[PDB]
Write a protein that binds this DNA or RNA. Structure first.
Ligand SMILES: [Mg+2]
Ligand SMILES: [Mg+2]
Ligand SMILES: [Mg+2]
Length: 430
DNA sequence: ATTATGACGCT
DNA sequence: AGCGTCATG
């Protein structure tokens, strides 16, 4: 009744750049614009591995994690851009720099949480209150929402996509109560107006297009963002949740696309998120633990409390390279050379980070994988990071991992290493 | 022979 | 601390 909380206290947006690395390459090279194109890492093995795909290329079935040679079988005219290689490894600096450009624009509208290289959550609650105060009870025109979809509409008693979008928006706006400054639906709508403005600013000032979701929490905003891509935004209201979730596979909700989600499905014998409502909070906690159970109980009703953290910068700065199959490192010279390459890239990135962001990392994490281990990381060990010096950092990493060499010989390394990873962590202001 | 990251939970 | 899970450009 009146005391059952409904999780409608915040306005949260998730902004996600469309096919991000592709857009960075298309800005730089106009010949790639409005073409089926993909971004690849490396080239010798099967043409390189695709990591980002333009929407034109997706129409042919090209996806991430596909080898370029196979993508070319699906789309012979596919255009490819290669990630830069420095010190023998992929170097993602261009995309990190482009990400900073976008995150700085977003931060003008509200405090953001950098969730990944190309996506950020936005807490718009206060900005919405402000814009509502300025509105003075004036209604929201559909002209202010030119790329917004309202999930679940139109409904009830034209065969073109834009026409359907507009009918849904008109139904939504007609049902809006514009005088209640505390109406959650009105707050979401104003949030969407703000996000239209933020997305327009990103495109004007960078050239990059993005999609966005607007809802009452991070999980719904992320889900909403995915409903209409690319270059569109979607409002998921609290009221839209029962219908949306009634046919939503559990794996589509963030955090449930892996083992936990598969166990929800198998243990409870359900398929869709809405089916979770039939279980008590204690039942869900008994199966999935106290934290997961309470989270599932609320989430399946559209309610989630995780805050938008005020954090625009990554918490760690890392450098990683796999040495698959026959390229695995089997000599101490090899291991030292690659640790040095990784450490030199890490030093460059850390020095730039210290100048830009007034902080210093204090912990170096070294991770390796040995040949034949199913896990992605075979061993992880930390040591002190007291100086931004690549030779020191690589020597320290070698000292930390050298007891892993099973070889009786000091020159050989066995079993050979299939992955090296150096990560700087535990930043302190300076 | 996917790869290169990056966040966060568990114990 | 070191490990596992989830994401997924
Ligand atoms: Mg994206
Ligand atoms: Mg993203
Ligand atoms: Mg993606």
């Amino acid at each position: 009744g009146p005391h059952m909380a409904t999780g409608q206290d915040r306005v949260v947006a998730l902004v996600d750049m469309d096919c991000f690395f592709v857009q960075v390459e298309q800005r730089q090279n106009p010949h790639l614009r409005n073409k089926p194109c993909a971004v690849v890492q490396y080239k010798s093995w099967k043409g390189g591995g695709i990591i980002a795909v333009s929407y034109e290329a997706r129409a042919f079935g090209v996806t991430r994690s596909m080898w370029a040679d196979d993508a070319k079988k699906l789309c012979p005219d596919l255009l490819l851009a290669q990630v830069r290689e420095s010190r023998g490894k992929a170097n993602l600096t261009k995309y990190r720099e482009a990400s900073v450009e976008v995150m700085e624009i977003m931060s003008r509208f509200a405090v953001i949480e950098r969730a990944s290289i190309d996506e950020a959550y936005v807490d718009l609650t206060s900005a919405v209150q402000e814009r509502l105060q300025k509105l003075q009870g004036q209604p929201i025109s559909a002209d202010l929402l030119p790329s917004t979809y309202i999930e679940g509409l139109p409904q009830g008693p034209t065969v073109q996509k834009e026409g359907m979008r507009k009918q849904g928006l008109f139904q939504w706006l007609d049902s809006l109560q514009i005088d209640n400054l505390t109406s959650p639906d009105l707050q979401l709508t104003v949030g969407a107006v703000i996000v239209e403005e933020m997305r327009a600013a990103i495109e004007r000032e960078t050239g990059f297009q993005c999609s966005a979701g607007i809802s009452h929490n991070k999980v719904l905003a992320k889900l909403a963002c995915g409903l209409n891509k690319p270059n569109r935004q979607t409002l998921v209201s609290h009221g839209s949740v029962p219908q949306l979730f009634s046919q939503m596979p559990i794996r589509k909700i963030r955090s449930l696309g892996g083992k936990l989600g598969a166990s929800v499905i198998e243990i409870l014998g359900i398929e869709y998120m809405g089916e979770l409502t039939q279980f008590t909070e204690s039942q869900l906690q008994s199966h999935f633990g106290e934290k997961n159970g309470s989270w599932l109980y609320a989430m399946c009703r559209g309610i989630e409390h995780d805050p938008v953290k005020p954090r625009q910068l990554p918490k760690t700065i890392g450098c990683s390279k796999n040495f698959p199959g026959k390229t695995a490192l089997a000599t101490r010279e090899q291991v030292q050379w690659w640790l040095l390459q990784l450490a030199q890239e890490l030093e460059e990135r850390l020095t730039k980070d210290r100048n830009d962001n007034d902080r210093v990392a204090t912990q170096l994490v070294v991770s390796i994988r040995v040949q034949g281990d199913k896990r992605l990381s075979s061993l992880r060990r930390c040591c002190a990071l007291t100086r931004y010096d690549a030779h020191k950092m690589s020597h320290d990493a070698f000292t930390v991992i050298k007891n892993c060499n099973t070889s009786g010989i000091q020159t050989e390394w066995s079993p050979p290493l299939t992955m090296l990873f150096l990560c700087a962590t535990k930043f302190s202001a300076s």
